[PDB]
């Protein structure tokens, strides 16, 4: 477990307060559109299994499918973005606080670097 | 690439929402329009690739393959509408959906800029093909053919997935541009040998290599006509494209690891041509000819010179077109007499003249007849192999002689002689079949007219 | 609630509460061309119970969609007239008819049990799945069907009828075979005029030797002759004064009734084992014919979708349903 | 560790080996299963009493409670098997195969 | 009538509008990669008096 | 069984699992295991027949032995540390005992035979609940105690589970035994990734649970418990067979379906830890699972088997009970590959 | 009338239809409000607007 037991972590909290400082996902997010597509597919499959007209029947039910998927997808995307931002924050903090473990290296040009040549023949 | 990708994902709902008798018309018209749109990818640069976005890019190697796929879809639609007359509307739409999904996956495969996305898409291409084969095949052996095809491909490709994730962990990226610019030599070690083996073996199984090719006759003979067309024209070119893409990071280990594969390719090219000489099934003959041509392509990619890559690209395009046309001709014959035996139907020149002309032109393109792009690619590969060594000319000459022998043997057996007396249901050739043959053959001649469009980035 | 289920059960709907001690299952039985149908009509109308005529072919057609019978090619694929004309067919018509009739009787018994458990009103059936086997034995002893067909019938009957409650009253009408043949000749229908005397005798032997001895142990059995069956007043009086507490119905409880009602209200679970993968040439249908006939059935007018979602039969508000 | 702990752990091991090696009767294996919990109870109370973990003295009683719950479950399954077959032999539990 | 023609031939706009939407999304993807616009050493130049960006 | 008693037994099973997953005390975790088993036995014996009774007996014996070993491990750990909190275990012997007990509870090889035996013995609803929930709990305990897991023992049992599941599923014709061997193989994959990334373990658990729920609910909808019984479903409701086919393709790990995501992520994570031989063997061995999934797909949807004559009456009648969340489980088990980076949210 | 028995879904369950539409509308308006508040809080915390 990498980020389990992280200091200051409140248990059973889907989205902490520190996540409010990150940019929320746009409503036209391609991931949100894909979640809505999944909801629409679920509605179509529901109509197919219940032997209703797949495309025409149950418009309210299909709309509820799409809406529920979009809602949960928006919150899931918020949590995913928060976790990735937290990972980057921790990585940068560790790199900064361990300079002897992460030292800068002198940059040499390819005019100085000697690379062996392997002819293709 | 979205201007081409989205119209396919719109072909899907159009197919599912069109009327029962209009599905073929709508699909054919809009597939032809999408092919015309995709013709704009041929305008490539001399320095680098066309980098549309972070996810998709096009090159002088990807563009002809994409154009070939987009052109191949409507021909498959024509053949499928030929052999699926009594099907239900839902199953017709499902077959069209499988073809559309396959085309979409192939487009995204050829334009994918990362190796892992390329792996995902080129493995996703298996599901529609397996469904098509094992569902709309005519004979019992379709199930075994599908099992062989699927398991050969997957047993080849899983070590490729492991190698790709390992390479990402080691180098930081699987992006093709980054791995090309940041490439480092591969030292002679067991670990590097097995990484090279994983990648090359995946794509060799896809090619297929000699000794790893039984699934090809199994699937090609037992698949429906559209499945046979897509399997030979495009799905065999994923291996060559992948090998021409991965070999950037496999040097200088390709100088020493290519010997067994080169020997297998050359000797199995000879052996599969000889097998073509003694085939009692027409589809099997076409499949083994495909095996020989792809073995020549493997030789080109393994010798890995700028003259070999151009020949490999030209031969891949030419073989795709020619093999698709041959499968279509054999399928028309099968739809006549309901049997794949070559010697069952004879005198087809005196019974169907214009189909005899189509057979003649297809056979002349199958063998390297100048100035066809088939001969252009084969001659470039032979010249590169000659620079590699001077007995490859002996092997290539033997292969060319046997190729001409079996091509003209097929032509003379099917078309010449006297007709079978008791076969009296050979109706005159349809306008649809004639148009299918014309659309197969004319672009090949136009490509012969303009050959720099299919010679790859090394041109 | 709004539909029977575990929620209704925990809410408090109880079959014992619903019953009124007049909720009885009465099955009238007899040989071919008896007065059993008229006797069942009279008993049902005098006792105020619901009458269920004999479940022949197209009973499921009568209970589903519109009540009109469907095509024989789509519902049953068997012919009683063809069985009479050529009993020893080479296409398995005899056993196809027998198995289809058993399935129809199973469906009718499930419907009757559902009606009794949901309304409390008794039901009078013109025949049951417990009396159906007599025609199977009559066919078998006459060489009309095969031992494999008999074994498949026995397997299906076991796994299906083992789950239901036997009738309260079994009323058998005994008529001699010469009288049966005289009535058949008087009726004048040619196909049943082709019935032989041995076939009629086998049915009576199966009734006398197996069905009646088997039903006697379970509950009361009433036997009447032609004259006795003609006077239904005495039959109803005899039924009304039957004392019996040895049947499984007194042993049934609310939970057992709940399980039985959940079973009988599900018509696909009733017919679950009527189609088991036993490949007899009589009853097995090939893939191509199965696909074609299924396509035709789906092309039937009110059969493409669920009952509430068929626009071509005048169903509206589909987009909000 | 003293030899008393060794003896209790050996008793648990013996009772475990007995359960894993059936002979004919399910009741005998149920008795072997009951003995394992007796050894667990003895070991736990010996450990707790020696370390003066005062609040842990209630754990062995809960152990006994769930022990006899398991014993009740085993007895119920045994009576169902015996009703089905006439004997509590484990050889009759062979309808299901791997 | 005219209604039936639209009722049946309305699927013929799906692929064209998909092509239009694909071109639009290609423009959207291109406009996110403008961090080296008029900054490459090869193609760097001074803007004309009546232009804001070198390309779009 | 009264519906109130059945729902209270389900509530008690869930209460035992939740007690295991919320407790910080080894005694309370053991109590949760005991409560789960006690309320789970009658669920297995709900539909009374000799097969159900035998399955319940075997399940009870296996789980009782595992609980005895688990409590012995707890006591041995307490002896050398005096600690009741569930953390890294302080004694290697106690850790080995706990690992073997939890592997036996899960069904990891060589403790697997009871899984096909019980799954065949019990009905479809019982098998669904068994597989899903009874894998849910011990995996939680293992994830909590992962940092003391012996990698050699865990990976050995995982690879054995993968191989044995593949071979058993190859041989079986019964759908419940096929599902049991599939469960064994998936548990092998999960426990193989466990000593490296509990997040990947949880991801594989979620995807496996979704696919298993979809498959079991499809089987309940079709009322088919054998291969030939499933071969008749194309003639009554062909949509269910197609959905089952795509679900089977997903469970085999074929891209671009949901079943490829756990295998892909696990292979990547194990490669990050310089493991190549194990990922390659695990990837190659799953082709057996794919083969018998494909064999099942041939019989049900890709080909048309012969049917019977009462199927016409079955046509005339309509399915009454509605499966809850079946379309959602079918969609989530096939079309969530583009949503892979949500495992960070799962973290 | 076509069916011999009144179908269970003969007429729309208006209670279920109204609840479905209301739930969809409520979820959409709640999502819009949540997104607006999230954008405002992000701007306020980062000192953008
Ligand atoms: C649309 C493209 C989708 C691509 C994939 C995307 C993901 C999946 C889609 C979601 C699920 C869709 C519904 C599934 C069930 C469909 C059932 C059916 O009959 O459907 C017919 C139905 C119309 O018929 P109907 O009158 O309602 O009822 C007739 C009966 O159903 C007649 O039924 P029947 O009784 O005749 O049933 C028999 C039939 C029953 O067969 C089926 O029901 C087939 C479909 C179900 C199988 C599984 C579907 C996929 C589920 C997810 C799995 C992964 C998918 C991706 C896989 C990739 C790799 C392969 O079985 C067979 O024929 C058996 C032989 C074949 C078996 C072997 C082949 C199996 C292939 C499995 C994979 C298929 C992938 C694509 C599926 C596309 C489905 C439309 O049409 C559709 O459902 C079309 C799709 C919805 C279109 C919406 C259009 C909206 C308006 C235009 C929008 C334009 C774009 C918007 C943007 C703005 C533009 C301006
Ligand atoms: C058995 C007789 C035998 O060894 O035949 C080799 C022979 C290869 O041709 P070659 O021209 O004799 O080999 C050139 C040098 O001798 C060997 O080449 P080199 O000395 O320049 O060093 C390169 C060598 C480096 O050597 C090593 O890496 C040796 C260490 C073991 C590598 C194992 C790799 C396995 C890869 C998957 C093979 C699946 C089959 O590369 C390989 O060993 C390549 C291994 C893959 C060969 C082709 C795989 C497809 C076979 C299709 C037919 C299957 C039936 O035939 C086969 O490998 C297939 C037929 C025999 C089985
Ligand atoms: C406490 C307050 C709430 C109480 C609610 C129940 C009481 C009121 C209704 C009532 O009387 O129900 C009686 C009714 C029993 O009546 P019955 O006539 O004996 O029916 C027998 C069969 O259920 C009849 O068979 P069936 O075909 O109706 O099967 C029903 C049931 C049979 O299956 C189950 O009961 C298994 C339930 C757990 C499934 C696995 C969940 C996995 C979650 C993984 C982690 C996700 C994060 O469910 C399924 O077959 C599909 C379950 C799908 C679950 C999907 C979960 C996604 C998350 O009780 C139930 O159906 C179970 C209620 C369980 C309540 C506890 C919470 C769950
Ligand atoms: C103050 C007043 C307002 C309070 C507001 C409420 C505060 C939050 C309340 C949360 C609900 C109450 C508790 C209910 C149970 C909590 C469940 C959840 O919230 O907890 C989080 C858990 O969240 C879930 O894990 C994320 C669900 C993600 C679902 C998708 C998984 C990703 C699948 C990848 C493919 C995606 C496909 C697309 C899916 C549709 C983190 O809890 P944590 O204590 O730390 O977990 C410990 C175990 N760990 C550490 C190993 C994780
Ligand atoms: C320690 C690592 C090794 C562990 C195992 C690694 C597995 C390696 C890859 C396995 C591939 C999976 C395919 C094999 C599945 C088992 C096949 C089998 O059981 O043989 C019998 C089977 C016949 O029986 P059934 O079809 O089941 O039905 C009989 C009806 N009466 O034989 C067959 O015809 C099936 C053949 C399947 C396709 C043939 C194999 C394809 C090629 C295999 C090698 C791949 C080449 C690599 C490139
Ligand atoms: C039975 C005999 C089977 C022989 C065929 C081999 C297939 C079995 C797979 C089992 C693995 C065997 C080879 C293992 C090679 C390996 O793991 O090392 C490769 C190297 C390890 O380096 P490090 O661990 O970091 O060492 C650091 C040094 N300081 O990692 C890599 O390069 C990734 C390579 C992926 C593993 C490739 C294994 C398969 C080899 C290619 C064969 C392709 C077969 C294709 C099948 C088609 C025809 C059947
Ligand atoms: C009716 C049948 C059921 C299917 C309903 C499909 C639509 C459901 C949503 C309705 C509209 C809700 C809404 O307000 O969406 C707006 C929101 C974006 O709004 P916002 O980003 O604030 O505005 C732009 C600012 N730059 O938009 C979003 O956030 C997008 C979320 C939805 C993604 C949908 C993906 C496709 C769903 C299936 C479409 C099917 C279309 C054809 C239906 C034919 C029916 C016969
Ligand atoms: C957090 C909630 C989880 C789900 C809880 C409820 C589960 C049981 C109920 C759903 C059963 C299957 C759906 C189809 C039902 C068909 C029968 C019918 O007519 O249903 C009508 C119903 C709308 O009824 P209504 O009461 O208005 O619903 C809103 C709440 N009052 O129509 C519907 O309900 C159809 C739309 C359902 C929504 C899709 C399913 C939930 C998806 C939530 C988003 C997350 C997706 C991933 C889920 C797993 C991970 C969390
Ligand atoms: N299981 C069966 N097998 C063959 N024929 C049957 C079966 N059950 C009923 N029949 C036929 O259906 C008809 C039932 O009517 P019947 O018993 O003569 O009473 P009624 O004279 O009142 O119509 C008979 O002609 C009988 O031959």
**String of DSSP letters for F97-132:** HHHHHHHHHHT-TTS-THHHHHHHHS-HHHHHHHHH
Cα separations (Å) of G39 from A32, B282, F114, G36? 17, 67, 55, 5
Identify which of B310, B452, B292 has the alpha carbon closest to the alpha carbon of residue B381.
Answer: B310
The CB density around residue D3, as the number of other CB atoms within 10 Å, is 8
Burial of E1 (0-12, 13-18, 19+ CB in 10 A): exposed
* Torsion angle in degrees (nearest 10) through CA of F305, F310, F313, F318: -50
To one decimal, the resolution in angstroms is 2.9
Q: How far apart are CA F71 and CA D63, in angstroms?
A: 9
Q: Look at the block and give the residue holding tokens 């899931």.
A: A76
Q: F234: Cβ–Cβ under 8 A, 6 or more apart, which residues?
A: F241, F300, F301, F304, F305
Among F162, F284, F286, F292, which residue has the most ligand 5 atoms within 8 Å of its CB, making it the best to mutate? F284
* Two tokens, residue G47: 């000192």
Q: How far apart are CA C186 and CA C193, in angstroms?
A: 9
Q: Look at the block and give the residue holding tokens 């006792």.
A: C47
Q: How far apart are CA F237 and CA A48, in angstroms?
A: 10
- The answer to whether the beta carbons of residues F98 and F145 sit under 8 Å apart is yes
Alpha helices by DSSP H, listed for B346-430, are 348-351, 353-366, 373-388, 392-415
Q: Which helix (H) or strand (E) holds C51?
A: strand C50-52
Q: Look at the block and give the residue holding tokens 């054999």.
A: B330
**String of DSSP letters for C218-237:** HSEEEEE-HHHHH-HHHHHH
Q: How far apart are CA B14 and CA B281, in angstroms?
A: 38
Q: How far apart are CA F106 and CA F101, in angstroms?
A: 9
Size of interface C-F (CB pairs under 8 A): 101
Q: Is F276 in the pocket of ligand 3 (CB under 6 A)?
A: no
Q: Is C127 annotated as a binding residue?
A: yes
F311 at the C interface (CB within 8 A)? yes
Q: In what order do the strands lie in the sheet with C169-173?
A: C50-52, C123-125, C25-30, C169-173, C220-224
Contact state of A63 with G39 under an 8 Å Cβ cutoff: no
Q: How far apart are CA C136 and CA C149, in angstroms?
A: 9
- The answer to whether the beta carbons of residues F174 and F226 sit under 8 Å apart is yes
Contacts of F23 in chain A (CB under 8 A): none
Q: Chain-centre distance of CA F243, in angstroms?
A: 20
Length of chain G: 49
Among B208, B260, B271, which residue has the most ligand 2 atoms within 8 Å of its CB, making it the best to mutate? B260
Q: Look at the block and give the residue holding tokens 């199965």.
A: C290
Q: Residue D73: inside a domain, yes or no?
A: yes
Regarding beta strands B57-58 and B50-51, do their DSSP bridges make them parallel or antiparallel, or are they unpaired?
antiparallel
Domain boundaries, chain E: 1-56
Residue of F nearest to D27 (CA): F61
The CB density around residue A105, as the number of other CB atoms within 10 Å, is 5
Point out the residue among E15, E25, E33 whose CB comes nearest to the CB of B7.
E15
Q: F168: Cβ–Cβ under 8 A, 6 or more apart, which residues?
A: D98, F116, F177, F180, F181, F184
Q: Look at the block and give the residue holding tokens 């071969």.
A: F231
**String of DSSP letters for F155-200:** HHHHHHHHHHHHHHHHH--BHHHHHHHHHHHHHHHHHHHTTT-HHH
Burial of F288 (0-12, 13-18, 19+ CB in 10 A): buried
* Two tokens, residue F191: 């426990």
Q: A39: Cβ–Cβ under 8 A, 6 or more apart, which residues?
A: A65, A66, A67, A68, A69, A70
* Torsion angle in degrees (nearest 10) through CA of F187, F191, F197, F201: 20
Geometric angle at alpha carbon B327, from B324 and B331, rounded to 5°: 140
The CB density around residue C195, as the number of other CB atoms within 10 Å, is 18
Length of chain E: 56
Q: Is C35 annotated as a binding residue?
A: yes
**String of DSSP letters for chain G:** ---SS--TTSS--HHHHHHHHHHHHHHHHHHHHHHHHHHHHHHHHHT--
- The answer to whether the beta carbons of residues B135 and F297 sit under 8 Å apart is no
Q: How far apart are CA B264 and CA A109, in angstroms?
A: 43
CA terminus-to-terminus distance, chain G:
65
Identify which of F93, F76, F92 has the alpha carbon closest to the alpha carbon of residue F26.
Answer: F76
* Two tokens, residue B403: 């190729």
Q: Chain-centre distance of CA B413, in angstroms?
A: 26
Q: Which chains touch D (3 or more CB pairs under 8 A)?
A: F
- The answer to whether the beta carbons of residues C270 and C129 sit under 8 Å apart is no
Q: C210: Cβ–Cβ under 8 A, 6 or more apart, which residues?
A: C133, C134, C137
Geometric angle at alpha carbon C259, from C253 and C264, rounded to 5°: 120
Identify which of A36, A55, A34 has the alpha carbon closest to the alpha carbon of residue A44.
Answer: A55
Contact state of A52 with C309 under an 8 Å Cβ cutoff: yes
Map residue C125 onto helix, strand or coil.
strand
* Number of structural domains in chain D: 1
* Two tokens, residue A65: 């499918």
Q: How far apart are CA F77 and CA F89, in angstroms?
A: 7
Q: Chain-centre distance of CA F334, in angstroms?
A: 18
Maximum CA pair distance of chain B?
69
* Two tokens, residue F10: 């389900």
Taking the centre of ligand 7 as the mean of its atom positions, its distance from the CA of residue A66, in whole angstroms, is 8
Residues forming a β-bridge with C28: C171
Identify which of B153, B154, B99 has the alpha carbon closest to the alpha carbon of residue B128.
Answer: B99
Q: How far apart are CA C49 and CA C123, in angstroms?
A: 5
Q: Is C132 in the pocket of ligand 9 (CB under 6 A)?
A: yes
CATH at residue D18? 1.10.287.3510
Q: How far apart are CA B67 and CA D41, in angstroms?
A: 77
Q: How far apart are CA F40 and CA F14, in angstroms?
A: 10
The residue among A53, A56, A60, A62 with the most chain C CBs within 10 A of its CB, best to mutate, is: A53
Cα separations (Å) of E9 from B7, B9, B10, B266? 17, 18, 15, 54
Alpha helices by DSSP H, listed for chain C, are 6-11, 15-18, 36-47, 59-63, 80-85, 93-119, 133-141, 147-161, 177-187, 190-193, 197-206, 212-218, 226-230, 232-240, 248-251, 254-264, 267-270, 287-299
Q: Look at the block and give the residue holding tokens 């940059």.
A: A107
Residue A112: DSSP 8-state: T
The CB density around residue G49, as the number of other CB atoms within 10 Å, is 8
Contacts of F206 in chain A (CB under 8 A): none
Helical packing angle, C232-240 and C36-47, nearest 10°: 50
- Structure-solving method: cryo-EM
- Phi and psi at C52, nearest 5°, equal -115, 100
Map residue D25 onto helix, strand or coil.
strand
* Two tokens, residue F51: 């097969």
Q: Is F345 in the pocket of ligand 4 (CB under 6 A)?
A: yes
Q: Domain range holding D57?
A: 3-92
**String of DSSP letters for B30-65:** HHHHHHHHHGGGG---SSS-EE-SSSBEE-TTHHHH
Q: B33: Cβ–Cβ under 8 A, 6 or more apart, which residues?
A: B7, E15
Breaks (C-N over 2.5 A) in chain A follow: none
Q: Residue D68: inside a domain, yes or no?
A: yes
Point out the residue among B146, B147, B162 whose CB comes nearest to the CB of F283.
B162
- The answer to whether the beta carbons of residues B80 and B225 sit under 8 Å apart is yes
For D19-24, the CB contacts below 8 A with 24+ separation are D19/F65, D19/F68, D20/F65, D22/D90, D24/D89, D24/D90, D24/D91
Residue of C nearest to A55 (CA): C319
For B29-33, the CB contacts below 8 A with 24+ separation are B30/E12, B30/E15, B31/B70, B31/B73, B31/B74, B31/B77, B32/B74, B33/B7, B33/E15
Q: How far apart are CA B414 and CA B155, in angstroms?
A: 38
Q: Is C31 annotated as a binding residue?
A: yes
Breaks (C-N over 2.5 A) in chain G follow: none
Q: How far apart are CA A32 and CA A25, in angstroms?
A: 9
- Phi and psi at B203, nearest 5°, equal -75, -30
G13 at the A interface (CB within 8 A)? no
Length of chain A: 121
């Amino acid at each position: 477990t990498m980020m389990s037991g992280r200091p200051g972590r409140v248990p059973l909290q889907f989205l902490p307060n520190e996540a409010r400082s990150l940019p929320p996902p746009k409503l036209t997010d391609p991931r949100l559109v894909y979640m809505g597509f999944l909801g629409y597919c679920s509605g179509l499959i529901d109509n197919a299994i219940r032997r209703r007209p797949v495309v025409s029947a149950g418009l309210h039910r299909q709309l509820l499918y799409v809406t529920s998927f979009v809602f949960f997808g928006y919150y899931l995307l918020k949590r995913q973005d928060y976790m990735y931002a937290l990972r980057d924050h921790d990585m940068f903090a560790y790199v900064k606080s361990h300079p002897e473990d992460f030292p800068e290296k002198d940059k040499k040009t390819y005019g100085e670097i000697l690379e062996e040549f392997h002819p293709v023949r | 690439m979205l201007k081409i990708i989205i119209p396919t994902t719109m072909l899907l709902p159009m197919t599912w929402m069109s009327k029962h008798n209009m599905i073929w018309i709508n699909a054919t018209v809009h597939s032809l329009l999408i092919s015309l749109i995709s013709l704009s990818l041929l305008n490539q640069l001399g320095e680098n690739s066309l980098n549309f976005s972070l996810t998709f890019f096009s090159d002088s190697l990807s563009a002809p393959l994409l154009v070939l796929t987009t052109w191949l879809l409507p021909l498959m639609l024509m053949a499928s509408q030929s052999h699926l007359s009594k099907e239900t509307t839902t199953r017709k739409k499902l077959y069209i959906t499988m073809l559309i999904l396959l085309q979409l996956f192939l487009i995204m495969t050829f334009t994918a800029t990362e190796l892992i996305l390329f792996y995902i898409l080129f493995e996703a291409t298996l599901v529609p093909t397996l469904i098509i084969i094992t569902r709309w095949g005519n004979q019992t052996e379709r199930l075994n053919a599908g099992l062989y095809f699927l398991f050969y491909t997957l047993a080849g490709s899983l070590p490729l997935l492991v190698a790709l994730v390992y390479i990402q962990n080691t180098t930081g990226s699987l992006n093709f541009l980054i791995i090309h610019y940041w490439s480092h030599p591969l030292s002679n070690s067991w670990s590097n040998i097995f990484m090279w083996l994983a990648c090359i073996m995946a794509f060799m199984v896809k090619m297929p290599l000699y000794g790893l090719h039984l699934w090809l006759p199994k699937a090609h003979v037992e698949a429906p006509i559209a499945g046979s067309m897509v399997l030979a024209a495009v799905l065999l070119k994923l291996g060559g494209y992948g090998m021409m893409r991965i070999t950037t990071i496999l040097n200088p280990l390709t100088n020493y690891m290519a010997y067994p594969f080169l020997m297998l390719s050359m000797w199995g090219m000879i052996m599969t041509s000889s097998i073509c000489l003694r085939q009692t099934d027409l589809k099997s003959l076409i499949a083994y000819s495909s095996v020989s041509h792809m073995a020549l392509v493997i030789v080109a990619i393994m010798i890995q010179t700028p003259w070999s890559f151009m020949g490999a690209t030209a031969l891949m395009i030419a073989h795709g077109l020619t093999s698709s046309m041959l499968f279509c001709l054999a399928n028309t014959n099968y739809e006549r007499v309901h049997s794949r035996t070559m010697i069952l139907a004879r005198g087809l020149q005196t019974l169907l003249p214009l189909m005899a002309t189509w057979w003649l032109v297809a056979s002349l393109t199958n063998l390297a007849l100048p100035p066809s792009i088939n001969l252009i690619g084969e001659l470039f590969i032979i010249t590169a192999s000659f620079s590699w060594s001077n007995i490859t000319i002996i092997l290539m000459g033997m292969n060319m002689m046997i190729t001409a022998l079996y091509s003209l043997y097929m032509l003379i057996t099917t078309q010449r002689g006297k007709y079978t007396h008791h076969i009296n249901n050979i109706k005159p050739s349809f306008t649809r079949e004639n148009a299918l043959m014309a659309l197969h053959i004319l672009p090949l001649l136009l490509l012969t007219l303009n050959p720099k469009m299919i010679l790859g980035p090394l041109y | 609630r709004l539909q029977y289920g575990p929620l209704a059960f925990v809410l408090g709907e109880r079959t014992t509460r619903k019953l009124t001690e007049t909720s009885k299952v009465i099955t009238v039985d007899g040989n071919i061309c008896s007065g059993k149908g008229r006797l069942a009509r009279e008993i049902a109308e005098k006792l105020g119970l619901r009458h269920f005529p004999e479940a022949g072919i197209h009973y499921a057609d009568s209970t589903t969609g519109d009540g009109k019978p469907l095509d024989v090619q789509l519902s049953g694929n068997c012919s009683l007239e063809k069985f009479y004309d050529d009993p020893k067919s080479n296409d398995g018509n005899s056993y196809r008819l027998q198995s289809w009739l058993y399935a129809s009787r199973l469906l009718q018994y499930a419907d009757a049990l559902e009606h009794l458990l949901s309304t409390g009103q008794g039901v009078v059936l013109e025949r049951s799945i417990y009396s159906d086997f007599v025609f199977l034995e009559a066919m078998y002893r006459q060489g009309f069907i095969r031992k494999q067909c008999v074994e498949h019938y026995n397997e299906v009957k076991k796994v299906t009828a083992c789950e239901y409650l036997p009738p309260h009253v079994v009323v058998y009408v005994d008529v001699p075979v010469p009288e049966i043949q005289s009535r058949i000749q008087k009726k004048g229908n040619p196909h049943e005029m082709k019935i032989t005397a041995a076939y009629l005798q086998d049915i009576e032997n199966a009734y006398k030797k197996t069905f009646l001895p088997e039903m006697s142990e379970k509950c009361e059995v009433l036997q009447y002759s032609a004259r006795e069956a003609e006077d239904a007043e005495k039959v109803v009086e005899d039924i009304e004064y039957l004392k019996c507490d040895k049947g499984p119905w007194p042993d049934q409880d609310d939970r057992t009734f709940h399980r039985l009602r959940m079973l009988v209200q599900n018509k696909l679970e009733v017919l679950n084992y009527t189609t088991i993968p036993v490949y007899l040439p009589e009853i097995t249908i090939g893939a191509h014919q199965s696909d074609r006939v299924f396509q035709k059935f789906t092309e039937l007018p009110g059969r493409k979708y669920s009952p509430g979602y068929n626009e071509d039969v005048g169903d509206k508000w589909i987009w909000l349903k | 560790m003293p030899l008393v702990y060794m003896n209790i752990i050996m008793a648990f091991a013996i009772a475990l080996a007995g359960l894993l090696m059936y002979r004919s009767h399910l009741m005998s294996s149920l008795l072997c299963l009951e003995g394992m919990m007796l050894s667990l109870f003895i070991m736990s109370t010996l450990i707790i009493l020696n370390t003066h973990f005062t609040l842990a003295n209630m754990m062995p009683i809960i152990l006994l409670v769930f022990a006899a719950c398991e014993a009740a479950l085993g007895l119920s399954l045994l009576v169902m098997v015996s009703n089905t077959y006439g004997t509590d032999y484990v050889q009759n539990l062979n309808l299901l195969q791997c | 009538n005219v209604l039936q023609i639209v009722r049946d031939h309305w699927v013929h706009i799906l692929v064209p509008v998909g092509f239009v939407f694909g071109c639009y999304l290609d423009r959207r993807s291109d406009e996110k990669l403008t961090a080296f616009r008029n900054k490459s050493l090869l193609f760097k130049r001074e803007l004309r008096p009546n232009e804001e960006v070198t390309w779009k | 069984m009264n519906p109130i008693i059945y729902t209270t037994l389900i509530m008690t099973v869930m209460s035992g699992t939740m007690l295991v997953m919320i407790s910080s005390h080894w005694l309370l975790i053991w109590i949760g295991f005991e409560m789960n088993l006690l309320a789970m036995i009658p669920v297995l014996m709900k539909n009374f027949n000799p097969r159900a009774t035998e399955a319940a007996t075997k399940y009870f014996l296996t789980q009782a032995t595992a609980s005895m070993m688990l409590m012995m491990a707890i006591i041995i750990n307490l002896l050398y540390s005096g600690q009741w909190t569930i953390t890294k275990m302080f004694n290697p012997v106690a850790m080995t005992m706990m690992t073997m007990a939890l592997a036996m509870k899960l069904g990891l090889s060589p403790f697997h035979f009871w899984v096909p035996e019980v799954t065949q013995g019990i009905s479809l609803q019982a098998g669904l609940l068994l597989l899903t929930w009874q894998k849910l709990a011990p995996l939680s305990v293992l994830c909590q105690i992962s940092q003391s897991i012996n990698p050699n023992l865990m990976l050995t049992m995982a690879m054995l589970s993968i191989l044995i599941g593949g071979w058993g599923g190859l041989n079986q014709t019964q759908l419940r035994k096929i599902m049991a061997y599939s469960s064994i193989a998936h548990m092998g994959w999960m426990t193989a990734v466990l000593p490296y990334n509990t997040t990947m373990t949880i991801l594989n658990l979620l995807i496996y649970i979704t696919m298993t729920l979809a498959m079991f609910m499809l089987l309940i909808h079709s009322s088919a418990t054998t291969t030939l019984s499933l071969s008749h479903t194309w003639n009554k409701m062909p949509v269910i067979t197609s959905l089952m086919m795509v679900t089977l393709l997903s469970m085999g790990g074929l891209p671009p379906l949901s079943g490829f995501m756990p295998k892909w992520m696990i292979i990547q994570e194990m490669t990050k830890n310089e493991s190549i031989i194990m990922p390659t063997l695990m990837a190659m061995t799953a082709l057996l699972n794919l083969y018998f999934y494909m064999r099942l797909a041939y019989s049900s949807s890709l080909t048309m088997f012969p049917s019977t004559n009462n199927m016409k009456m079955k046509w005339q009648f309509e399915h009454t009970k509605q499966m809850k969340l079946l379309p959602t489980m079918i969609v989530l088990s096939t079309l969530v590959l583009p949503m892979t980076p949500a495992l960070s949210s799962l973290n | 009338k076509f069916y011999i028995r009144e179908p269970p879904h003969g007429s729309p369950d208006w209670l279920k239809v109204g609840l479905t539409l209301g739930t969809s509308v409520f979820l959409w308006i709640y999502l819009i409000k949540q997104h607006k508040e999230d954008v405002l809080e992000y701007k306020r915390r980062n000192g953008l607007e």
